[PDB]
Amino acid sequence: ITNLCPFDEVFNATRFASVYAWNRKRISNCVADYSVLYNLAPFFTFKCYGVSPTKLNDLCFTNVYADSFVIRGDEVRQIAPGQTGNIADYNYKLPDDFTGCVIAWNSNKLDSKVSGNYNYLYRLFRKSNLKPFERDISTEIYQAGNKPCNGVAGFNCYFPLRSYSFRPTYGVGHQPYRVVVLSFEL
Amino acid sequence: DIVLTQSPLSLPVTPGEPASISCRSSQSLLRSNGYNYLDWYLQKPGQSPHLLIYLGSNRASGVPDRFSGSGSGTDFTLGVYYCMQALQTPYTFGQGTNLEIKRTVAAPSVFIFPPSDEQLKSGTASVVCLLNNFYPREAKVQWKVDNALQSGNSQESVTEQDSKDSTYSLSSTLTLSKADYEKHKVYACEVTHQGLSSPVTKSFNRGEC
Amino acid sequence: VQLVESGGGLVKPGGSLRLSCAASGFSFITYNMNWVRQAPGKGLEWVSSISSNILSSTSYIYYADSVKGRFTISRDDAANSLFLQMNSLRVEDTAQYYCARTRSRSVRNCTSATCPVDAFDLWGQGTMVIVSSASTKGPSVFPLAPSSKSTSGGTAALGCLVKDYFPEPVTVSWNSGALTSGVHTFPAVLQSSGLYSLSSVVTVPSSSLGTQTYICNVNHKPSNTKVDKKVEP
Ligand SMILES: *[C@@H]1O[C@H](CO)[C@@H](O)[C@H](O)[C@H]1NC(C)=O
Numbered sequence A: 001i002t003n004l005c006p007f008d009e010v011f012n013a014t015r016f017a018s019v020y021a022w023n024r025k026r027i028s029n030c031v032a033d034y035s036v037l038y039n040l041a042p043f044f045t046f047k048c049y050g051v052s053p054t055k056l057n058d059l060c061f062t063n064v065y066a067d068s069f070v071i072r073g074d075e076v077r078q079i080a081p082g083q084t085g086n087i088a089d090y091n092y093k094l095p096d097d098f099t100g101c102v103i104a105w106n107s108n109k110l111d112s113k114v115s116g117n118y119n120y121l122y123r124l125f126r127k128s129n130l131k132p133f134e135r136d137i138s139t140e141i142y143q144a145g146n147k148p149c150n151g152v153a154g155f156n157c158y159f160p161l162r163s164y165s166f167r168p169t170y171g172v173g174h175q176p177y178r179v180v181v182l183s184f185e186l
Numbered sequence B: 001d002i003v004l005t006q007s008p009l010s011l012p013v014t015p016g017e018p019a020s021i022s023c024r025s026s027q028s029l030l031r032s033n034g035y036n037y038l039d040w041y042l043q044k045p046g047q048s049p050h051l052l053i054y055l056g057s058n059r060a061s062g063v064p065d066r067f068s069g070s071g072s073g074t075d076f077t078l079g080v081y082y083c084m085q086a087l088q089t090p091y092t093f094g095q096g097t098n099l100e101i102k103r104t105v106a107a108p109s110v111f112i113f114p115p116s117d118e119q120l121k122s123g124t125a126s127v128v129c130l131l132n133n134f135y136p137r138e139a140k141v142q143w144k145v146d147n148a149l150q151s152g153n154s155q156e157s158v159t160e161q162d163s164k165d166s167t168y169s170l171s172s173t174l175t176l177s178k179a180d181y182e183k184h185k186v187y188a189c190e191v192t193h194q195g196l197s198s199p200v201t202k203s204f205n206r207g208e209c
Numbered sequence C: 001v002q003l004v005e006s007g008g009g010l011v012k013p014g015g016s017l018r019l020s021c022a023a024s025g026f027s028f029i030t031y032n033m034n035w036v037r038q039a040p041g042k043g044l045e046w047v048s049s050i051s052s053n054i055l056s057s058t059s060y061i062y063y064a065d066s067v068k069g070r071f072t073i074s075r076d077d078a079a080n081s082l083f084l085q086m087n088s089l090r091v092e093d094t095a096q097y098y099c100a101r102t103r104s105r106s107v108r109n110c111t112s113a114t115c116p117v118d119a120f121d122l123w124g125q126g127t128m129v130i131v132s133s134a135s136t137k138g139p140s141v142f143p144l145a146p147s148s149k150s151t152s153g154g155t156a157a158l159g160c161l162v163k164d165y166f167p168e169p170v171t172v173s174w175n176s177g178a179l180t181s182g183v184h185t186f187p188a189v190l191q192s193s194g195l196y197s198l199s200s201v202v203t204v205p206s207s208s209l210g211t212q213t214y215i216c217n218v219n220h221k222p223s224n225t226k227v228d229k230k231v232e233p
Helices: A086-090 B178-182
Strands: A025-027 A064-071 A100-106 A121-123 A161-163 A177-184 B022-024 B040-043 B050-053 B070-072 B075-077 B080-083 B111-113 B124-132 B142-145 B154-158 B169-177 B186-191 B200-205 C003-006 C019-023 C033-038 C044-050 C061-063 C072-076 C081-085 C095-101 C127-131 C140-143 C155-165 C171-174 C183-185 C196-205 C215-220 C225-230
Touching: A025 A064, B022 B075, B111 B200, B111 C155, B124 B178, B124 B186, B124 C155, B124 C196, B169 B178, B169 C196, C003 C095, C044 C072, C044 C095, C140 C225, C155 C215, C171 C196, C183 C196
Parallel strands: none
Antiparallel strands: A064 A177, A100 A177, A121 A161, B040 B050, B040 B080, B070 B075, B111 B124, B124 B169, B142 B186, B154 B169, B186 B200, C003 C019, C019 C081, C033 C044, C033 C095, C044 C061, C072 C081, C095 C127, C140 C155, C155 C196, C171 C215, C215 C225
């Protein structure tokens, strides 16, 4: 069996989804070499767990689970199997025994306009943490106390979703980053 | 679906004491948990209106901590001002609030301008009698021709509030054709006021520049 | 944070009108908002509504009773653009349209026929949407004869009035802006023929009626007409 696996549109799309609304896609019965991921100069380290990036061609597996999102700077280090924080316990959590790694690179020249860009949103208020490999897209308000907020903005009533601020004049630690997650299972 | 009416059409205001306006509804807006659905808006002259008091007794950002929100059930009590109804699809607004400042009673100045000779050959004769510096609300200015009352041909324009001496100025224009103007010679306008014991009559005749 | 919009112009009854709104400084795709139109004569009035894309899976569109089904509006997530299309216009449909925006940021207990919201936190700059079957007319300024009866015998009020001009925005200057004492301006009044009439009068003492020169300048940018006319008693 020899066919061209669609590994191009997974991270070459014009517009990506939000952090809380990452898209899950499934591809099977396909082969693809991993040498195409060295084209970008600002490409970050693979820092892969379990399976080395060197021996990623001869190994054969079952399925590919790929999801992508756009996050700010100083945020790719929080994507770990065992980790805690804001974006890890609320939007995307990874299993401790999960085998695979992420792919990240700088995207300041694409996901940034001359005005304020707020098309990417992330959630930072939740009542409880989420299980790994769960997407929670919802606009239901939360209560910060005893006040029964029935969808009214005010004291102790805040929306979980907040919009990122991306500008070309911002620093390295606030630049947007295009991150696509790869998962390998046998 | 419903109509929201405001009791005070026009009241004077002073910086010494707060004012009071009310919006009257015809349906209950309590809904659940006592959440009254009625807003209040403040509109500057020639500017986009913003939000000051919302959801009845609750307050929003940008308040000067003076326009306190009070009201329960179908009764509420706090440029131009408007109120919102948030129960059905039509959002009824306020009609004619127009908060203006208290001013001393001043006698108005009646003036008349005869039409020019250039306007006579155009087939249309326009004569405007206006008045200036006087407490508002004297729109009962009438145009009289040879002791006869005419209606439906007079238009009145009202200017906004100035910051120099806070005095309005209303202009009442009257338009007739040349055929109706050449058949009459005496034209007069009546000016009335609450500060005048008797109305003042100003008249002129055709034949002089 | 502010809302900027444009696209207003002279529209014949019928046809289509291009009205667009833009958002900057805040998130656009997570906000439920609507449109608010204000007639020049009366106050504000509600026209339509549109639900957000990510707020609810099923989009909710609402319209006023007078324009139920007549207006077709939509929003675009890309480039922060909000649109408003037209199909038929009436002579009583003129107003000033405001880009309304709500602070609710959520939708609940809303059906396909009704949806309550709390308030509108911010409103953008309005657009001048005016309908007129007639075309553009050139302005004409007509002097008037002064009189000196009121405000004592030594004061005579005279002015320059404009008739048969189009459109509504017109600028009048007195003595090239030097004479600013006693200047008043009135807003436009609509006649039955669709034209406009206005007067501009500056109060002056009557002791300088034979020496001081009075000139009135009319500025009309859409008509591109500059007329200077002298007034004499
Ligand atoms: C993505 O697009 C770039 C530019 O067209 C191209 O160089 C690159 O090979 C593409 N990625 C893949 C996986 O084909």
